[PDB]
Amino acid sequence: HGVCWIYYPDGGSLVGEVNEDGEMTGEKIAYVYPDERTALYGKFIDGEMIEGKLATLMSTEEGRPHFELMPGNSVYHFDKSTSSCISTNALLPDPYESERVYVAESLISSAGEGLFSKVAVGPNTVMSFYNGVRITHQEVDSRDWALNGNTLSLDEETVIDVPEPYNHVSKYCASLGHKANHSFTPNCIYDMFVHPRFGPIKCIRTLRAVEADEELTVAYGYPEWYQVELKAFQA
Numbered sequence: 001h002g003v004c005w006i007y008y009p010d011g012g013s014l015v016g017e018v019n020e021d022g023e024m025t026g027e028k029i030a031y032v033y034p035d036e037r038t039a040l041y042g043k044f045i046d047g048e049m050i051e052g053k054l055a056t057l058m059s060t061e062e063g064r065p066h067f068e069l070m071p072g073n074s075v076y077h078f079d080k081s082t083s084s085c086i087s088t089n090a091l092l093p094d095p096y097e098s099e100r101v102y103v104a105e106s107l108i109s110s111a112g113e114g115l116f117s118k119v120a121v122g123p124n125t126v127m128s129f130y131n132g133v134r135i136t137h138q139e140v141d142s143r144d145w146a147l148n149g150n151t152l153s154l155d156e157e158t159v160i161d162v163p164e165p166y167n168h169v170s171k172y173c174a175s176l177g178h179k180a181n182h183s184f185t186p187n188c189i190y191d192m193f194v195h196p197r198f199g200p201i202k203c204i205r206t207l208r209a210v211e212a213d214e215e216l217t218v219a220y221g222y223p224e225w226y227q228v229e230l231k232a233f234q235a
């Protein structure tokens with residue numbers, strides 16, 4: 001009847017006053033990231049972000065949030081990918097991700113770029129998002145292996161991909177989860193995530209404490225490089 005909070009299992013949430021139909025609709029609705037501080041505040045219809053401006057959750061009083069807008073014109077909208085359109089704005093970074101990870105040359109030899117943490121954080125921390133185009137398992141499983149360097153299964157119906165040329169940071173930096181390299185002693189896992197911009201996707205979540213400038217890795221769980229590293233690790 002007053003402010004309503006809808007939390008996702010991933011830690012993010014929607015907050016605001018609902019309409020007579022109990023819908024998250026209005027000009028003062030917010031999505032709040034899992035840090036419970038970073039927020040997209042503004043215009044939502046039935047929980048869907050129409051115009052979210054970057055904001056900070058300064059305080060909450062009896063469930064009533066106080067938002068303060070961040071400087072600038074950073075605005076976001078629900079912009080779910082299709083099979084061929086990865087994003088309406090490929091070069092607009094995610095502000096939560098931007099504060100937590102960067103891309104640099106991997107420490108794994110001959111592995112290319114990697115994903116690194118900007119910050120020391122604890123276990124179970126969402127660090128990065130894995131958005132991409134949405135194609136079927138049949139399309140993926142029935143094509144050249146070489147097309148599948150960036151494919152990540154989302155669910156039973158959907159596979160996420162970051163195809164050429166979006167695998168280059170110069171062409172796509174809206175999300176960076178596809179830059180995390182593989183390890184058999186990973187410090188992160190892929191996890192489900194409901195994103196106000198990208199919709200249902202996966203994220204990179206730490207398995208434990210990670211330091212600032214530590215490379216973030218995930219076990220790919222299956223490709224040449226991989227079967228070699230496998231032999232290197234069993235020893």
Ligand SMILES: CCCCCCNCCN(CC[C@H](N)C(=O)O)C[C@H]1O[C@@H](n2cnc3c(N)ncnc32)[C@H](O)[C@@H]1O
Nearest residue numbers: 110111112113149150151152178179180181182220225
């Ligand atoms: C669930 C299964 C996983 C699905 C998501 C996979 N997304 C992988 C993207 N690539 C990581 C980013 C790459 N380094 C780049 O510069 O865009 C992976 C590519 O990077 C190299 N790579 C990754 N891990 C490696 C390792 N442990 N050793 C050597 N090379 C590695 C290799 O070329 C691979 O195709």
